[model samples]
Target: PIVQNLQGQMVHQAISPRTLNAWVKVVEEKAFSPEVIPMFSALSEGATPQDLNTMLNTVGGHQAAMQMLKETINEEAAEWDRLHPVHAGPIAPGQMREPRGSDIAGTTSTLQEQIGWMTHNPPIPVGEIYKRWIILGLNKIVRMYSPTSIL
Candidate 1:
């Protein structure tokens, strides 16, 4: 989630402790496979208790805001599920032999066109714009591929 500071600069905050502990408890109660224990343990080792607490709080606040957003969106006159409606099959080498009405090919072409356009028509605050775009793009890709996966 993005928050603007007094200087008008946007900063991303980590989640809170109560929420983090709750989530950890849920996962542990489920007895997630032993393989996953090491992964979680590694994460815990890397983050200090204070860091985890701060992250959980931030996450709880973000989740609350998102819940409100979902309700607001649902109440809208033109509500719609934004999940990818275009189910083009994954790209394959042979399939790309000829573009031939292929959605995957079209998607790639469109992305390339966007990159070209961005290169030539840079934003006023180039560095900030570039950084924001990179962040947005990464977030979009992560959400698309791993919606339930946490950082």
Candidate 2:
């Protein structure tokens, strides 16, 4: 993991050669636009969205970079939400206003849940369970609820 100082904490997304190569293909194709390519520092570190944001904040001209970067990422996120009307839309309840994408995958582990029952469940059940579990595990749980054969 490439550790870089960001807010006094190491924030870097380590990228492997294989993954980096894969991203090269994804980026070159249509995953993102050519404009975003320069915004991308290097596929070397496997920088995540947050890490890329930090890079946007730290490197180059802060005054100009963050200003435009924020604009770009905001618009990007907005367009994403707009396109995926099912996931997120105009209004969100309470604090969260946008989707966290893979946040649940990172925050919780199936192994941890099955083993310890951390019980420290999702802050917003709607965001985590009904949304994700409903898609991932809950879908399976539903199948189990109405079993095809119970013999």
Candidate 3:
């Protein structure tokens, strides 16, 4: 029997090389897009929506790229998990504690303060402002929710 120590856990590795290669291929294909060049360029220069759309076909174009990136990341994470199954003992109730009161309070205060700051000091560029607000909202939600099977 072969035992591999992964992330401080001794586990049997069961990753399929073929499957990993296939996923890698899919990620490679998804990463190959000409649109990223101009989108990143425009973002650096703070280009307008019209300019961005003109550079790429539509706003939807970026959505496709995002979906691809997300898929790739998911596949990569799955592969990693397959190679190293996390030890359940490490996460036992007393072994690992939940977030403390100060942790929660600090996070809440930071989120509220950031929200108020953004509201008061609006972004100079409309696109930047919208992007900042979207990021802020996402951060708050992610902080509140623990990743469950449903998520």
Candidate 4:
């Protein structure tokens, strides 16, 4: 959802809203995984699967692999099925926190103060609101543009 030129018609011309989620998923994985630096010796690979399907299947199955995250929610990702274990969703939005005491005093002006505030008085941002314009869009595009690419 990264916005390069919002003022222009880039949203329609360059961005494809239909595939945004998959693109974002790839970005989060690729950006955070295995760290980064100019590698000289290491042959730049490991158990990392060629595609998500392969990775999930190798680790028992997709359901089993996701169990890692679900288990990790309140505790560490330990077992595949811990007895009568409750399997939850991958990620959930955290509750919004209201500014307390003195923090609430300055919120009146903060809301309308800026388009993108450097530092805001009122607690307003991604976690704070459910419905709001994402001033900063993130479009994590996953590419497979080889000679014989499927997409």
lDDT (Cα atoms) of all candidates against the true structure: 0.35, 0.35, 0.34, 0.24
Can you tell me which runs of candidate 3 are displaced by over 4 Å?
1-61, 87-151
Instruction: Quote the positional error of residue 151 for candidate 2 in Å.
Output: 68
lDDT of 1 by residue, 1-151 (tens): 2235787543334444564676566545633333333434343332322333343233324444334433343322122113323344777864432122121112233433322322233312222322332223333433444456666
Best by TM-score: 2
> What are the per-residue Cα lDDT tens digits for candidate 4 across 44-129?
11111112223223222234324432333213111212322443445447523322211112232232222122123442331111
Model 2: per-residue Cα lDDT over 88-141, one tens digit each? 466645533324422222233232221122123323222222122212221232
List runs of model 2 lying over 4 Å from the truth.
1-45, 87-151
Report the lDDT of model 3 for residue 4: 34
> Which residue pairs show backbone clashes in model 2?
none
| Model 1 C-alpha lDDT versus the unseen true structure | 0.35
Q: Candidate 2 at residue 12, lDDT?
A: 36
For every candidate structure, what is the RMSD over all alpha carbons to the true structure, in angstroms? Answer: 16.7, 16.6, 20.7, 17.3
TM-score ranking, best first:
2, 3, 1, 4
Backbone clashes under 3 angstroms, per model: 10, 0, 0, 6
TM-score of each: 0.21, 0.32, 0.24, 0.19
Q: How many backbone clashes does candidate 2 have?
A: 0
C-alpha positional error of residue 137 in candidate 4 after TM-score superposition, expressed in Å: 24
Better of 2 and 3 by lDDT: 2
